[PDB]
């Protein structure tokens, strides 16, 4: 005998850059509780989804310059039947402000290099970030850029400007974001102007779509007669040796002769001929066994080889 | 019969069935709300059970629950290599120190 | 209080309580032969908790074996965040995707 209650004190908080904490609690009027009960959490927007969870309390990582709305059941399930209540209602509105008053295109790139400066850490992650202004943004409204990956944001202080003086691009030589990272970049680009209202504009990145790959380092090729040797060495990433994905062309510059090989070994070695002369570039990529997949390396400076 | 190599072709595996895998839109799987990967294994493969408990036994599909299931037991394997060789004091403090840097260092806090 | 200061702390107190806990030579407590640590938490803390049962806990030898005690209870409240939420099938294999890539990036 059992009619199911919805939970009360249904809250949602923004708890950082694109991050908001669902909380509710279980409603006390519900029936002693002798059978384990849990809860289903519906998201209606900005992007939907729905799970369910054993606690009272659930982080939801999700833009919010479009306002957001989410849903919390009671849940009762057995074999023979499942059972679920009404749903409590909670929504954050949208940022006051005109549509064009937000910033166009934002884009970000990270790119790792080596910390000499900090014994304390292996490698920095740079942070540049592009935007346009807007059709309908003010002529005296000024932009500020936010990021945040896990729980450290940072507010930009290297800021390139436009002709009237209002933030259009970003640059952070030093973050917080790992090398390694496997989280989200949440990214906040805000507005301000004493004569309107401007909408603000965030966005969640992966890091491996975003991260440029350093070019393979020390790249030669020698010619011992009737053979090629290339050598090169795994670009300045935090990620080790395993975990590349390397194209090398080898170009005769003679007929137009191509070969391209997709490899992850650091070295290379093929037939050409005594007779022409040779170019070599080599291209690196982190391999889909470390991380999902991500951008090419620039091809290396052409090495011509031989004669 | 090795296991470096396998999670390569696992991986790689579960890049072209998962349009198969993700059709059963009702299951819903126990997912680490963090990215502490290696604290999550005993929930990770109890979830992999019950999406292989419950999805059509084909043909290039039940090779990967092998090898998902091979992988395992490497695991399982690494588990019980944690606390079956006893070692003098303090070999035992200098693991700690490991330990608490990477957590340190490494792990999202 | 907050994990990340209190692991920089445990760190520092750990380094000069060594000597002190070196003592007994009879005591023999598990330790791995391989570095994937977050396999062995429960080994790392049975092996914790043999020397507060060993040890005297009388100047910062305490304050030691009790940010160990709330560092095992950090580690504690990941492994119950391993199973809280269940989500969609799509979900899970980006974790166990991202899982995997994981332990070949770290071997």
């Not at chain 2, 006893?86 to 340190?104: H, I, K």
Request: with cysteine; glycine share 4%; hydrophobic share 35%.
């Amino acid at each position: 005998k059992i009619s199911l209650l919805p939970p009360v004190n249904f809250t949602i908080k923004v708890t950082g850059l694109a991050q908001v904490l669902l909380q509710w609690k279980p409603n006390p009027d519900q029936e002693q509780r002798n059978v384990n009960l849990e809860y289903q959490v519906k998201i209606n927007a900005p992007k939907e989804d729905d799970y369910e969870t054993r606690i009272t309390e659930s982080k939801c990582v999700t833009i919010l310059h479009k306002g957001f709305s989410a849903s919390v059941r009671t849940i009762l399930q057995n074999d023979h039947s499942l059972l679920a209540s009404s749903w409590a209602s909670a929504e954050l509105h949208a940022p006051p402000g005109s549509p064009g008053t937000s910033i166009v295109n934002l884009t970000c790139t990270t790119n790792t290099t080596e910390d000499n400066y900090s014994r304390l850490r292996s490698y920095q992650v740079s942070l540049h970030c592009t935007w346009l202004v807007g059709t309908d943004a003010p002529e005296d409204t000024q932009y500020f850029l936010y990021y945040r990956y896990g729980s450290w944001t940072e507010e930009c202080q290297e800021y390139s400007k436009d002709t009237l003086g209002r933030n259009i691009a970003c640059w952070f030589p030093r973050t917080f974001i790992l090398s390694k990272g496997r989280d989200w970049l949440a990214v906040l680009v805000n507005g301000s102007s004493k004569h309107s209202a401007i909408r603000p504009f965030d966005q969640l990145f992966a890091l491996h779509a975003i991260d440029q790959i350093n070019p393979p380092l020390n790249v030669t090729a020698e010619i011992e007669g009737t053979r090629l040797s290339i050598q090169w060495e795994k670009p300045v990433s935090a990620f080790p040796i395993h975990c590349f994905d390397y194209e090398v062309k080898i170009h005769n510059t003679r007929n137009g002769y191509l070969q391209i090989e997709k490899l992850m070994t650091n070295a290379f070695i093929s037939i050409i001929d005594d007779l022409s002369k040779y170019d070599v570039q080599v291209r690196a990529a982190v391999s889909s066994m470390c991380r999902e997949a991500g951008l090419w390396s620039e091809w290396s400076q052409p090495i011509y080889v031989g004669n | 019969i090795p296991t470096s190599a396998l999670v390569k072709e696992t991986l790689a595996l579960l890049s072209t069935h998962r349009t198969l895998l993700i059709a059963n839109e009702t299951l819903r799987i126990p997912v680490p709300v963090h990215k502490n990967h290696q604290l999550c294994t005993e929930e990770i493969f109890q979830g992999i059970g019950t999406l292989e408990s419950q999805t059509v036994q084909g043909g290039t599909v039940e090779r990967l629950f092998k090898n998902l299931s091979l992988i395992k037991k490497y695991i399982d394997g690494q588990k019980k290599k944690c606390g079956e060789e006893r070692r003098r004091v303090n070999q035992f403090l200098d693991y700690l120190q490991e330990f608490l840097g990477v957590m340190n260092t490494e792990w999202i806090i």
